[PDB]
Design a protein around this ligand. Sequence first.
Ligand code: MG
Ligand code: MG
Length: 170
Amino acid sequence: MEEDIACVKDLVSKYLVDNERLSRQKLAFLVQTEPRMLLMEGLKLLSLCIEVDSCNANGCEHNSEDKSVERILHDHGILTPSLCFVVPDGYKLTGNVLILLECFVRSSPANFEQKYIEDFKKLEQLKEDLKSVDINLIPLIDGRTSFYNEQIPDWVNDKLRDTLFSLLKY
Ligand SMILES: [Mg+2]
Ligand SMILES: [Mg+2]
């Protein structure tokens, strides 16, 4: 067990990052001593890895500060009307074109389909209001079927997950 905890911490500690958000999430994981907390913070780390991958792949800034769409636009210099409250995973403003990105994982096709529609509708509900201030929205929905990512190798991903779940048991 102490050996297993040392293993997953060794695996994660070697994951090199370039931003305060992923750095902070590593710290959150590496200080935990209780299995449920190690599991929760480890799984949260993998989820952030997926967001960062999705942002990189789609040319978006990662929304690491949980900005709403109003804040995203304001930070760029743009005033908004009243909007539904939406905190996307990534964004990019190029001229008057705003990309908003949401990513998720669903391993079952029916669930994938439903979640895809839910996330699409969450962003689409912004379109008309954004158009009223001459912003054209492109909603990007990056649905995945797994937690495999380009941030850590798949074998590390599996080993980390397998070992964290095994710690809940003793
Ligand atoms: Mg999010
Ligand atoms: Mg998401």
